[PDB]
Design a protein around this ligand. Structure first.
Ligand SMILES: [Mg+2]
Ligand SMILES: [Mg+2]
Ligand SMILES: [Mg+2]
Ligand SMILES: [Mg+2]
Ligand SMILES: [Mg+2]
Ligand SMILES: [Mg+2]
Ligand SMILES: [Mg+2]
Ligand SMILES: [Mg+2]
Ligand SMILES: [Mg+2]
Ligand SMILES: [Mg+2]
Ligand SMILES: [Mg+2]
Ligand SMILES: [Mg+2]
Ligand SMILES: [Mg+2]
Ligand SMILES: [Mg+2]
Ligand SMILES: [Mg+2]
Ligand SMILES: [Mg+2]
Ligand SMILES: [Mg+2]
Ligand SMILES: [Mg+2]
Ligand SMILES: [Mg+2]
Ligand SMILES: [Mg+2]
Ligand SMILES: [Mg+2]
Ligand SMILES: [Mg+2]
Ligand SMILES: [Mg+2]
Ligand SMILES: [Mg+2]
Ligand SMILES: [Mg+2]
Ligand SMILES: [Mg+2]
Ligand SMILES: [Mg+2]
Ligand SMILES: [Zn+2]
Lengths: 176, 38, 209, 54, 142
RNA sequence: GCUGAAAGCAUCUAAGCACGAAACUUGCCCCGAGAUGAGUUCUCCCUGACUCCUUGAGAGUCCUGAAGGAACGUUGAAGAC
RNA sequence: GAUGUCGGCUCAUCACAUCCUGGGGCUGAAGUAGGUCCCAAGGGUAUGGCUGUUCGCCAUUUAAAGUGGUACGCGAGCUGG
RNA sequence: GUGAAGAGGGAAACAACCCAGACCGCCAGCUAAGGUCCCAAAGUCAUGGUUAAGUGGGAAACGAUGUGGGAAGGCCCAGAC
């Protein structure tokens, strides 16, 4: 509908390849490639790519809209790149980064080594925070989700990992 | 989680959504409102 | 990896200097001659065939004698096969000795256990007997019931009954290797291995681990 | 056998269209809620009807 | 007089090869069973196996519609009590791909010694290469 | 759960991706090619004549008995046989 | 013109509406220990005193001492209270 | 009405259900119920819809932004949701 009809914008210095239903964006932050659904049609006007449902398929518009959103995210990732910051709120909860291994100390009786995927880069601006960068929104979200699932926020004190954008809703330990 | 044959919206935030052909109520506000149909 | 073929010499003990008596089984693991190498291209699986001991000249039949003479090895008393891991590679005629277990801590010994004959249910499956008295009649050790009733009206497969016990291939796993004396061709494992004295054992490295 | 049984409870056979309960003097939405609550206790499908001239 | 009946010693059987890629399982199997039984011949005879040898290639690329790929369940009882094993279509394709086509066709062929003799004439291959180049199989565009 | 529209938001799903239990398929052990779909690989053995015809994947005579097996005997921590 | 009828012993086998162990949601879940619901049938699942009793009570354990179907399983298997 | 005292075809099997009342023979044709992808004779028939649940091929109150059709109604380019 509205999202499906809203075209993307192709900035300067990015390459847009289209072979069959596979589409490819080579930006400055790297390379990305996605095989869209068969019900999807991507045109040109090589400045604003636009999307339409192919004839003969059911949802059609849903597939077109989801492909448009995917390519919006891909262009953002290859031009500016997505970045997510996580905090470790607790007693002596710490994170370190060695190349592509994030070491978590979370009260476990064993260190937690998390291997970053292919093109995701981690940093520790502070000993209690992680900053993740990458050109794939889905990949970076998956990495952050796994890191949080190491130690989801407690409802009683908010300890554990968390996203910055997250309002950890607490409740006081019951009286009596 | 409430596994009940009749799932309804229990507040302004409860949202009906069907996952895997199963009706569920997901509530951002009160986690007591998490229901599924069974 | 590969194992070896040994003979169960018997069972003894080893007194360690700290006054502990390890009950060990002695295996006469002499040299094993590789008579054949089976590869994927010709056989669909990687294995070696080994022989051990020595057999009577007039009792080695002509086909078996020819099979050994193809490898160029003296006719042993049998033939066993060992599957190969991808890294290892053996050649025909190679004599593999008990020094193969120099750095192996636990082994698996497989052999034919002792044949107890036709063993009843009480021996074979540890069924409990019935009252030796209190009125019992001709049923002091019988299996009792063997089914339900009209439903299912049949006895199920795999039911436990009397039959032949022992005399079958049994593998005792993760036996500690105490001593590996290559100069006398001996392997000493901590524990009891299947079969009677003089039987043939196949000793492989540990697989559980 | 041995005769009929003893009277245990009294029923009122209901045929489609029978207007069971009627209500007046309340707002329409509150009447709907009250009738929903009542119908939840009955073993027959119901519906909400209004007064008409004929 | 008496109606003509085919004589098993004088029947003529041909070799066909069918590439089962992208086809629907059951709709391939009905034609396979038809030609194995010999229902496509003027001299069809119910008590004579007059069918044709058929070689099914690419048995792992057979297709099924709907959710049958992850929801069709092949049950079988080992004969030991409690031994009701089962395997889904995808698991059975992964482990023993040609058994899918074989069961599909064996369910449609008549039950009996002649049915078994008919099913002996079906050659189902997981891959694309087939040994029987000596029999000069014909390309049967089912 | 991630990404994600249908439904400008939202949403674990409708495409796509991830995690997930002593259950399932394996991994461990035993049987197992009568698996009549009767598989594979080594090795060994036998390469003489002659009639008849119902000329058939025919029948028969002479000479020849191979590898091997079986039988018998002494027997076994194998065994009711 | 006969299908032996309670309980006990031996032997079991299946269901899941699960007693334990295994994975989860919510909690009036601080922690330990719970309550409740969802998934799960691989394995395990008391010994005695009383009584003919299954049952129940009681003693003492255990991770648990599951509920059921199987002619209220099982007398051409035993007993006969 | 049927069975009893009625065969035959259909309902998988199925006295009493649907079709139909066996004098005998035929390697002749047309049909009833019921059916025409293979078992298994006959449409992988034509036209237009619906379902995405293996529904079809067991079951209720009740619940639900599944999807299809219809008749309205409310707010809307002083640009509405
Ligand atoms: Mg013995
Ligand atoms: Mg006892
Ligand atoms: Mg006695
Ligand atoms: Mg969105
Ligand atoms: Mg009688
Ligand atoms: Mg359950
Ligand atoms: Mg099971
Ligand atoms: Mg298992
Ligand atoms: Mg008791
Ligand atoms: Mg006493
Ligand atoms: Mg007593
Ligand atoms: Mg009984
Ligand atoms: Mg019982
Ligand atoms: Mg009894
Ligand atoms: Mg008796
Ligand atoms: Mg009996
Ligand atoms: Mg009896
Ligand atoms: Mg008495
Ligand atoms: Mg009468
Ligand atoms: Mg009749
Ligand atoms: Mg009549
Ligand atoms: Mg009839
Ligand atoms: Mg019926
Ligand atoms: Mg019939
Ligand atoms: Mg008549
Ligand atoms: Mg006609
Ligand atoms: Mg037909
Ligand atoms: Zn709510």
């Amino acid at each position: 509908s509205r999202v499906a009809k809203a075209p993307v914008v192709v900035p300067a210095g990015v390459d847009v390849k289209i072979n069959g239903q596979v589409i490819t964006i080579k930006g400055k932050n790297g390379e990305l490639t996605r095989t869209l659904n068969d019900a999807v049609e991507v045109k040109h006007a090589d400045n604003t790519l636009t999307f339409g449902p192919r004839d003969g398929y059911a949802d059609g518009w849903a597939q077109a809209g989801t492909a448009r959103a995917l390519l919006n995210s891909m262009v953002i990732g290859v031009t500016e790149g997505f970045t997510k910051k996580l905090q470790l709120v607790g007693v002596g909860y710490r994170a370190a980064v060695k190349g592509n291994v994030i070491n978590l100390s979370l009260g476990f009786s064993h260190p937690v080594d998390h291997q970053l995927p292919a093109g995701i880069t981690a940093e520790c601006p502070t000993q209690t925070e992680i900053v993740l960068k990458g050109a794939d929104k889905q990949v970076i979200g998956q990495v952050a989700a796994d890191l949080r699932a190491y130690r989801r926020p407690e409802p009683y004190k908010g300890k554990g990992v968390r996203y910055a954008d997250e309002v950890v809703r607490t409740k006081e330990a019951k009286k009596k | 989680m409430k596994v009940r044959a009749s799932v309804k919206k229990l507040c302004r935030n409860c949202k009906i959504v069907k996952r895997d052909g199963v009706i569920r109520v997901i509530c951002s506000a009160e986690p007591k409102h998490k229901q599924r149909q069974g | 990896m590969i194992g070896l073929v040994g003979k169960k010499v018997g069972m003894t003990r080893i007194f360690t200097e700290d006054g502990v008596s390890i009950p060990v089984t002695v295996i006469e693991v002499e040299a094993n001659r590789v008579t054949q190498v089976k590869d994927l291209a010709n056989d669909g699986y990687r294995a070696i065939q080994v022989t051990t001991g020595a057999k009577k000249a007039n009792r080695v039949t002509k086909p078996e004698a020819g099979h050994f003479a193809k490898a160029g090895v003296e006719a042993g008393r049998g033939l066993w096969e060992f599957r190969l891991a991808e890294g290892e590679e053996f050649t025909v005629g190679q004599s593999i000795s008990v020094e193969l277990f120099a750095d192996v801590k636990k082994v698996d010994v497989t052999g034919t256990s002792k044949g107890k004959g036709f063993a009843g249910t009480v021996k074979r499956w540890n069924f409990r007997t019935q009252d030796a008295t209190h009125g019992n009649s001709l049923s002091h050790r019988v299996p009792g019931s063997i089914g339900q009733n009209q439903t299912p009206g049949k006895v199920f497969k795999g039911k436990k009954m009397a039959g032949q016990m022992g005399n079958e291939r049994v593998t005792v796993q993760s036996l500690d290797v105490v001593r590996v004396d290559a100069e006398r061709n001996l392997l000493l494992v901590k524990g009891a291995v299947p079969g009677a004295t003089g039987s043939d054992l196949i000793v492989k490295p540990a697989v559980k681990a | 056998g041995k005769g009929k049984g003893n009277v245990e409870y009294w029923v009122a056979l209901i045929q489609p269209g029978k207007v069971l309960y009627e209500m007046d003097g309340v707002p329409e939405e509150l009447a709907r809620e009250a009738f929903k609550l009542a119908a939840a206790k009955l073993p027959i499908k119901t519906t909400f009807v209004t007064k008409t001239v004929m | 007089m008496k109606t003509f009946t085919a004589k098993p010693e004088t029947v003529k059987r041909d070799w066909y090869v069918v590439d089962a890629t992208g086809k629907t399982l059951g709709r391939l199997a009905t034609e396979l069973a038809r030609r194995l039984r010999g229902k496509h011949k003027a001299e069809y005879t119910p008590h004579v196996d007059t069918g044709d040898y058929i070689i099914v290639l690419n048995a792992d690329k057979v297709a099924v519609t709907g959710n049958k790929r992850t929801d069709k369940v092949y049950y079988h009882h080992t004969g030991h009590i409690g031994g009701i094993k089962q395997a889904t279509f995808e698991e059975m394709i992964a482990r023993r791909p040609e058994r899918v086509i074989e069961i599909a066709v064996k369910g449609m062929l008549p039950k009996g010694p002649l049915g078994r003799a008919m099913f002996r004439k079906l050659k189902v291959y997981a891959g694309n290469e087939h040994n029987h180049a000596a029999q000069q199989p014909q390309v049967l565009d089912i």
